[PDB]
């Protein structure tokens, strides 16, 4: 009912340069880039999305619905659209998340991921999701692959191509009745937590997608990760109840994981936890790994 007064920024092709390919899939190609506005003495590191095949009117429509959703959000734990460039194909300008997706991040850096990071990431994902809930936006595709890493200490939720099939992250009402709610996103959040807690394991590995519905109906759920106390596992289990209303709310998940983040070694048991470290601005050459006048999108022309 409330008018959507979000601003759609049209950016000139000449103002940004593609540096390298970051990812390539069904979505098309994502490039690492630099955005150098008009004459503002700033360089903004950006991620540029462009579709791999054709210049079809159907492709342009799909990318513009994604732009509408990404331009309508504003939260530290959600990815916002910076702007669009109206080339023949039309491309999305987004914030560069230098450390990639959280799924690949936990797989590649498992030996240095301590309980503090895991629990803080759970808080951040719940904050983003609670924001999406307050904006009445149902994600429908929450997974560790869709959580991006700005810094190891700061993650954001992305992928709004489904926001208003990934069966192994879907709630029961979603598979059987196509019912999607903020409570069906809670189930997905449970699987995302499981992914993190197992340092990037594949949920129901080897089991075909058509067998998931039957498995869930029998009462089978993902197993207790070896680092998880019954406290952390019980939360995951509550996200996977049949009754959507019995599942935790995102605001409760923020509270529960925050309490745990205060004494993380009491809730996750990780061998050599205290001797583990990940990059932070404290690191020599943290930003180093044209570097003059560069500023992050979060500090530039704030909405
Ligand atoms: C490997 C990698 N490095 C990245 C650095 N920065 C971003 N920036 C952003 C910001 C918001 N949204 C996204 O992309 C999410 C996708 C892939 C779902 S998209 C481009 O289709 O919207 N990337 C994305 C990056 N990736 C992708 C392709 C997962």
UniProtKB/Swiss-Prot annotation:
Effect after changing residue 91 to R: Found in a lung cancer sample
Positions of post-translational Phosphoserine modification: 280, 284
What changing residue 138 to L does, per the record, is: Found in a lung cancer sample
Consequence of changing residue 49 to A/M = Abolishes kinase activity
Show the active-site residues. 141
Q: What is the effect of changing residue 23 to D?
A: Found in a lung cancer sample
Superkingdom field: Eukaryota
Q: Which residues form the Protein kinase domain?
A: 16-268
Look up what happens after changing residue 137 to V: Found in a lung cancer sample; more sensitive to gefitinib than wild-type
**Covalent cross-link (Glycyl lysine isopeptide (Lys-Gly) (interchain with G-Cter in ubiquitin)), residues:** 20, 41, 58, 61, 218, 249, 259
List the expressing tissues: Ubiquitously expressed. Isoform 2 is also expressed in ovarian cancers.
Where N6-(2-hydroxyisobutyryl)lysine occurs along the chain? 49
- Could you tell me which residues carry Phosphotyrosine? 287, 300
The record places the site described as Important for interaction with PIK3C2B at 300
Q: What is the effect of changing residue 142 to V?
A: Found in a lung cancer sample; more sensitive to gefitinib than wild-type
* PTM per Swiss-Prot/TrEMBL: Phosphorylated on Tyr residues in response to EGF. Dephosphorylation by PTPRJ prevents endocytosis and stabilizes the receptor at the plasma membrane. Dephosphorylated by PTPN1 and PTPN2. Monoubiquitinated and polyubiquitinated upon EGF stimulation; which does not affect tyrosine kinase activity or signaling capacity but may play a role in lysosomal targeting. Polyubiquitin linkage is mainly through 'Lys-63', but linkage through 'Lys-48', 'Lys-11' and 'Lys-29' also occurs. Deubiquitination by OTUD7B prevents degradation. Ubiquitinated by RNF115 and RNF126. Ubiquitinated by ZNRF1 or CBL at different lysines in response to EGF stimulation; leading to recruitment of the ESCRT machinery and subsequent degradation in the lysosomes.
In this chain, ATP is annotated as bound at 22-30, 49, 94-95, 159
List where in the cell it is found. Cell membrane; Endoplasmic reticulum membrane; Golgi apparatus membrane; Nucleus membrane
Q: Mutating residue 9 to A has which effect? A: Abolishes phosphorylation
Q: How does it assemble?
A: Binding of the ligand triggers homo- and/or heterodimerization of the receptor triggering its autophosphorylation. Heterodimer with ERBB2. Forms a complex with CCDC88A/GIV (via SH2-like regions) and GNAI3 which leads to enhanced EGFR signaling and triggering of cell migration; binding to CCDC88A requires autophosphorylation of the EGFR C-terminal region, and ligand stimulation is required for recruitment of GNAI3 to the complex. Interacts with ERRFI1; inhibits dimerization of the kinase domain and autophosphorylation. Part of a complex with ERBB2 and either PIK3C2A or PIK3C2B.
Role, per record:
Receptor tyrosine kinase binding ligands of the EGF family and activating several signaling cascades to convert extracellular cues into appropriate cellular responses. Known ligands include EGF, TGFA/TGF-alpha, AREG, epigen/EPGN, BTC/betacellulin, epiregulin/EREG and HBEGF/heparin-binding EGF. Ligand binding triggers receptor homo- and/or heterodimerization and autophosphorylation on key cytoplasmic residues. The phosphorylated receptor recruits adapter proteins like GRB2 which in turn activates complex downstream signaling cascades.
State the disease link.
Lung cancer: A common malignancy affecting tissues of the lung. The most common form of lung cancer is non-small cell lung cancer (NSCLC) that can be divided into 3 major histologic subtypes: squamous cell carcinoma, adenocarcinoma, and large cell lung cancer. NSCLC is often diagnosed at an advanced stage and has a poor prognosis. Neonatal nephrocutaneous inflammatory syndrome: An autosomal recessive disorder characterized by intrauterine growth retardation, premature birth, fragile skin, recurrent skin infections and sepsis, failure to thrive, nephrocalcinosis, and nephromegaly with tubular dysfunction. Some patients have chronic diarrhea, and necrotizing enterocolitis.
Q: Belongs to which family? A: Belongs to the protein kinase superfamily. Tyr protein kinase family. EGF receptor subfamily.
The name under which this protein is listed is Epidermal growth factor receptor
Taxonomic source organism: Homo sapiens
Identify the segment of the full-length protein shown. 697 to 1019 of 1210
